[PDB]
Amino acid sequence: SSFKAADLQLEMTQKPHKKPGPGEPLVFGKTFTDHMLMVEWNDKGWGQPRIQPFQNLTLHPASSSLHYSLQLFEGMKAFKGKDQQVRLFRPWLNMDRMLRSAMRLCLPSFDKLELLECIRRLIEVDKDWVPDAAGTSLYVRPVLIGNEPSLGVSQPTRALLFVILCPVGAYFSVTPVSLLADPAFIRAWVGGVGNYKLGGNYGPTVLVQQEALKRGCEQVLWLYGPDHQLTEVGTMNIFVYWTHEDGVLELVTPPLNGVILPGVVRQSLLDMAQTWGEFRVVERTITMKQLLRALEEGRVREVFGSGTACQVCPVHRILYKDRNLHIPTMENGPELILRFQKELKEIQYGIRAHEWMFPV
Amino acid sequence: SSFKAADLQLEMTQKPHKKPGPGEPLVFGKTFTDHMLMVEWNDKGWGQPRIQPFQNLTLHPASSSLHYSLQLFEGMKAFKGKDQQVRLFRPWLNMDRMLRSAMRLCLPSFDKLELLECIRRLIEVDKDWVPDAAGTSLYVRPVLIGNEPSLGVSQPTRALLFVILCPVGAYFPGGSVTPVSLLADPAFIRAWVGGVGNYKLGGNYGPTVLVQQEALKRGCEQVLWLYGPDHQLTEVGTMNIFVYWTHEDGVLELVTPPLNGVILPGVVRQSLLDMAQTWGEFRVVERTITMKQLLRALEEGRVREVFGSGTACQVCPVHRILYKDRNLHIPTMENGPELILRFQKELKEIQYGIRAHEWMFPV
Ligand SMILES: *Cc1c(COP(=O)(O)O)cnc(C)c1O
Ligand SMILES: *Cc1c(COP(=O)(O)O)cnc(C)c1O
Ligand SMILES: O=C(CO)N[C@@H]1CCCc2ccccc21
Ligand SMILES: O=C(CO)N[C@@H]1CCCc2ccccc21
Ligand SMILES: [Cl-]
Ligand SMILES: [Cl-]
């Protein structure tokens, strides 16, 4: 039995913080807003949600969130249009995804629309924090952690669902990135949990990302299997725009076979391209073997990653088997990329009205 | 750099918890002692270590420990012998394993002998919490977590090291004596080669909860984790698995899976190999074990004992494995269980100070 948005408790800050300075560098995830949502669950079901000042968490030292990684998160954006109106991009898919993560970790179920409403209310209260400068947004970070005060590994009897907000500018995306493609690093496995947005999938990538910087790359290209499938880039889904082995122009991204996180932007790019009907759009396994041949034969136009933070990130170099592979993404416009960026921007900032946007 | 035991600050508690009484059996991991260790790290390095009252943590909402699972833990035991002297079992090895975990997650390094001293100092303060009844001990849980107040996925600039203590009795109900049943379904993967299954990291355990529930639903108490096309037996629950049998070459052997990435290198595991190796009475090997081999060893009556090892259980017999829909009887209890009993007996004598040994670290 879910918490309800009707029952919200508002508690406004006693001393508001000073928003970032216009033009000053908004660093991603370092700056937070005045308020936060917090909801507690226990053996008396969910409690009343509350909007409250950005305050620390008080956890029992045995909290299962900290011992056995009973934690999952989401990530989505609110955009402030010209008319100072704020909109969430396809938040329903994030609520869908968060509930699936919750179940995977035996965490408590909740009503998707109730949480979206509390999020709406939370953003409303802090709507001024939502910046309006070009390419800026409010990053929204929901989290659900276990909070069992016992060392047993078991279905928790207690949990906390909370939400924080960051004004953001950018994360790197007009400029492309280099990838490290080393098969020894494995992000996720079939029958694993790489397809859920659980905190435990990210911690182990930190050292890997360091090795990429050490080898002069900016991101990890997570390979999988003996045929070296391209699964994902850092925390982004991967797309390739190429002329395929059968001479047909297509946009491919790996299918959702377990080792791919089902990105909201990924789906949106699939959706958007289908609607155009101008080229083939497919979900198919992509191997290094295939990418090398394609590059040698000049059939590759663009490689890019997708995700909420970067939206669409061009790729121009992959360090594979100790040798750099050039990727002509930037030579080729990048047309598909710039076109995707434009329409997403038009939609997100309200230029074109669209069912994907949810107004705050 | 590191924190130093010489710099320990002590804040004794002003509100002692009521210790557990008689007719109140110990539930594993639910009862905590009066004090905790706590050490913070940041840009200025490791702060000063302190033993303080058992209290809640105060965490920034963006704490990387909660969003990207920058968390690891340990688990070891303190045993009070008949003379009332308290000893830790091979703690050095837990410190070795904790530092390896920390490096894998880019968390701050520390001096093992310094943490161990702090842990000793901690247990000394809460010495009266250590039970002395047969099969009771004090379970010690160190933890290291990232504590960056930033949603970026990166090497943290702040961490928190803490240690809490639990007086414990048995882990399973009538545990180590009464055997357990296992669900062995190859749909479930605990870890993969090139993953982090060989580190004691929080992230490895949360996904298993649902699987544990599936074993209950199917009438089993534990999960036998299989890996690979040839269904290798990796671990059981949170224990390393061992098989004592007459292998296909007709030689009597104790086998356990090798440390090739999907196996958590348990201290009890390592100890059982050391003990058996030392004895020199049968062949002791680290080798992959597959279901095909087990099925064949069973139908040819070559298996004597199957069991799990780990700090909580110690040595745990298995009597049944449900392989998809085939219910396999494991004759562990009909074979004594002779090796299990021997291991338990020698571990008991070492742990409770019946027989002085270099494996025990006096508190
Ligand atoms: C969050 C995430 C993505 C992209 O998700 P969006 O919903 O598009 O922002 C891709 N891959 C991984 C591994 C992720 O964690
Ligand atoms: C802790 C643990 C073990 C056993 O470790 P010991 O050091 O023997 O207590 C075995 N397997 C897993 C998965 C573990 O987490
Ligand atoms: O939204 C995206 C994709 O561009 N990345 C975000 C950026 C913050 C760090 C992080 C960590 C885990 C999962 C997503 C993310
Ligand atoms: O000591 C052992 C093995 O017998 N298991 C412990 C028991 C507490 C629960 C847990 C959770 C994760 C890793 C180890 C453990
Ligand atoms: Cl999926
Ligand atoms: Cl190892």
PDB file of C-alpha atoms in Angstrom, chain B residues 69-163:
ATOM      1  CA  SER B  69      27.827   1.464  -3.659  1.00  0.00           C
ATOM      2  CA  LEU B  70      31.233   2.656  -2.528  1.00  0.00           C
ATOM      3  CA  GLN B  71      31.105   0.228   0.343  1.00  0.00           C
ATOM      4  CA  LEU B  72      32.926  -2.841   1.569  1.00  0.00           C
ATOM      5  CA  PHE B  73      32.872  -4.849   4.761  1.00  0.00           C
ATOM      6  CA  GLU B  74      34.568  -7.544   6.749  1.00  0.00           C
ATOM      7  CA  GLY B  75      33.529 -10.208   9.214  1.00  0.00           C
ATOM      8  CA  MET B  76      35.598 -12.074  11.783  1.00  0.00           C
ATOM      9  CA  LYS B  77      35.209 -13.543  15.235  1.00  0.00           C
ATOM     10  CA  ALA B  78      36.451 -13.016  18.765  1.00  0.00           C
ATOM     11  CA  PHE B  79      36.297 -16.044  21.031  1.00  0.00           C
ATOM     12  CA  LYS B  80      36.452 -16.027  24.854  1.00  0.00           C
ATOM     13  CA  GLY B  81      38.255 -19.173  26.126  1.00  0.00           C
ATOM     14  CA  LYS B  82      37.495 -20.831  29.505  1.00  0.00           C
ATOM     15  CA  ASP B  83      40.160 -18.633  31.198  1.00  0.00           C
ATOM     16  CA  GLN B  84      38.156 -15.544  30.064  1.00  0.00           C
ATOM     17  CA  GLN B  85      40.942 -14.467  27.696  1.00  0.00           C
ATOM     18  CA  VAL B  86      39.516 -13.163  24.356  1.00  0.00           C
ATOM     19  CA  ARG B  87      41.130 -14.015  21.034  1.00  0.00           C
ATOM     20  CA  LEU B  88      40.619 -13.107  17.404  1.00  0.00           C
ATOM     21  CA  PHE B  89      40.877 -15.787  14.728  1.00  0.00           C
ATOM     22  CA  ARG B  90      43.443 -14.985  11.998  1.00  0.00           C
ATOM     23  CA  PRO B  91      42.468 -11.293  11.929  1.00  0.00           C
ATOM     24  CA  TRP B  92      45.490 -10.346   9.841  1.00  0.00           C
ATOM     25  CA  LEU B  93      43.841 -12.093   6.913  1.00  0.00           C
ATOM     26  CA  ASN B  94      40.649 -10.038   7.288  1.00  0.00           C
ATOM     27  CA  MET B  95      42.751  -6.901   7.301  1.00  0.00           C
ATOM     28  CA  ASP B  96      44.522  -8.120   4.147  1.00  0.00           C
ATOM     29  CA  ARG B  97      41.150  -8.715   2.508  1.00  0.00           C
ATOM     30  CA  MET B  98      39.665  -5.416   3.637  1.00  0.00           C
ATOM     31  CA  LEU B  99      42.529  -3.421   2.114  1.00  0.00           C
ATOM     32  CA  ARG B 100      42.199  -5.364  -1.170  1.00  0.00           C
ATOM     33  CA  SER B 101      38.486  -4.515  -1.227  1.00  0.00           C
ATOM     34  CA  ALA B 102      39.331  -0.845  -0.492  1.00  0.00           C
ATOM     35  CA  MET B 103      41.786  -0.638  -3.335  1.00  0.00           C
ATOM     36  CA  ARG B 104      39.284  -2.258  -5.749  1.00  0.00           C
ATOM     37  CA  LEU B 105      36.771   0.515  -4.931  1.00  0.00           C
ATOM     38  CA  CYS B 106      39.407   3.318  -4.870  1.00  0.00           C
ATOM     39  CA  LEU B 107      38.745   3.876  -1.200  1.00  0.00           C
ATOM     40  CA  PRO B 108      41.523   5.059   1.097  1.00  0.00           C
ATOM     41  CA  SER B 109      44.235   2.673   2.136  1.00  0.00           C
ATOM     42  CA  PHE B 110      45.192   2.245   5.793  1.00  0.00           C
ATOM     43  CA  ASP B 111      47.718   0.361   7.979  1.00  0.00           C
ATOM     44  CA  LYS B 112      46.438  -3.139   8.762  1.00  0.00           C
ATOM     45  CA  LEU B 113      48.279  -3.494  12.048  1.00  0.00           C
ATOM     46  CA  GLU B 114      46.934  -0.083  13.123  1.00  0.00           C
ATOM     47  CA  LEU B 115      43.296  -1.017  12.335  1.00  0.00           C
ATOM     48  CA  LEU B 116      43.792  -4.342  14.080  1.00  0.00           C
ATOM     49  CA  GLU B 117      45.056  -2.565  17.227  1.00  0.00           C
ATOM     50  CA  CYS B 118      42.065  -0.222  17.125  1.00  0.00           C
ATOM     51  CA  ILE B 119      39.832  -3.265  16.737  1.00  0.00           C
ATOM     52  CA  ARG B 120      41.581  -4.921  19.702  1.00  0.00           C
ATOM     53  CA  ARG B 121      41.158  -1.713  21.724  1.00  0.00           C
ATOM     54  CA  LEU B 122      37.506  -1.695  20.763  1.00  0.00           C
ATOM     55  CA  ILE B 123      36.891  -5.293  21.805  1.00  0.00           C
ATOM     56  CA  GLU B 124      38.787  -4.676  25.072  1.00  0.00           C
ATOM     57  CA  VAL B 125      36.338  -1.902  25.929  1.00  0.00           C
ATOM     58  CA  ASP B 126      33.372  -4.166  25.159  1.00  0.00           C
ATOM     59  CA  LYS B 127      35.039  -7.317  26.565  1.00  0.00           C
ATOM     60  CA  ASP B 128      32.060  -8.170  28.806  1.00  0.00           C
ATOM     61  CA  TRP B 129      29.891  -8.349  25.686  1.00  0.00           C
ATOM     62  CA  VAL B 130      31.825 -11.395  24.464  1.00  0.00           C
ATOM     63  CA  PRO B 131      29.822 -14.500  25.370  1.00  0.00           C
ATOM     64  CA  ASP B 132      31.522 -17.638  26.766  1.00  0.00           C
ATOM     65  CA  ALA B 133      28.891 -20.351  26.269  1.00  0.00           C
ATOM     66  CA  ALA B 134      29.817 -23.190  23.869  1.00  0.00           C
ATOM     67  CA  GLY B 135      29.510 -22.139  20.224  1.00  0.00           C
ATOM     68  CA  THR B 136      29.165 -18.457  21.080  1.00  0.00           C
ATOM     69  CA  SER B 137      31.447 -15.683  19.938  1.00  0.00           C
ATOM     70  CA  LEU B 138      31.645 -11.953  19.204  1.00  0.00           C
ATOM     71  CA  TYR B 139      31.082 -11.134  15.533  1.00  0.00           C
ATOM     72  CA  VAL B 140      33.148  -8.146  14.432  1.00  0.00           C
ATOM     73  CA  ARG B 141      32.003  -6.076  11.405  1.00  0.00           C
ATOM     74  CA  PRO B 142      34.433  -3.514  10.001  1.00  0.00           C
ATOM     75  CA  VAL B 143      33.110  -1.301   7.213  1.00  0.00           C
ATOM     76  CA  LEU B 144      34.700   1.195   4.839  1.00  0.00           C
ATOM     77  CA  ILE B 145      32.420   3.463   2.758  1.00  0.00           C
ATOM     78  CA  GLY B 146      32.901   6.346   0.346  1.00  0.00           C
ATOM     79  CA  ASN B 147      31.304   9.561   1.541  1.00  0.00           C
ATOM     80  CA  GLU B 148      31.549  12.058  -1.302  1.00  0.00           C
ATOM     81  CA  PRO B 149      28.662  14.546  -1.228  1.00  0.00           C
ATOM     82  CA  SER B 150      28.618  14.552  -5.064  1.00  0.00           C
ATOM     83  CA  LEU B 151      26.576  12.645  -7.659  1.00  0.00           C
ATOM     84  CA  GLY B 152      29.666  12.272  -9.887  1.00  0.00           C
ATOM     85  CA  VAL B 153      30.938   8.661 -10.198  1.00  0.00           C
ATOM     86  CA  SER B 154      34.558   9.119  -9.103  1.00  0.00           C
ATOM     87  CA  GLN B 155      37.310   8.329  -6.591  1.00  0.00           C
ATOM     88  CA  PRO B 156      36.004   9.789  -3.395  1.00  0.00           C
ATOM     89  CA  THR B 157      37.699  12.557  -1.490  1.00  0.00           C
ATOM     90  CA  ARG B 158      36.082  11.548   1.777  1.00  0.00           C
ATOM     91  CA  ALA B 159      35.552   8.156   3.415  1.00  0.00           C
ATOM     92  CA  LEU B 160      34.410   6.704   6.716  1.00  0.00           C
ATOM     93  CA  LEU B 161      35.795   3.587   8.421  1.00  0.00           C
ATOM     94  CA  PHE B 162      33.831   2.075  11.260  1.00  0.00           C
ATOM     95  CA  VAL B 163      33.512  -1.130  13.225  1.00  0.00           C
TER      96      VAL B 163
END
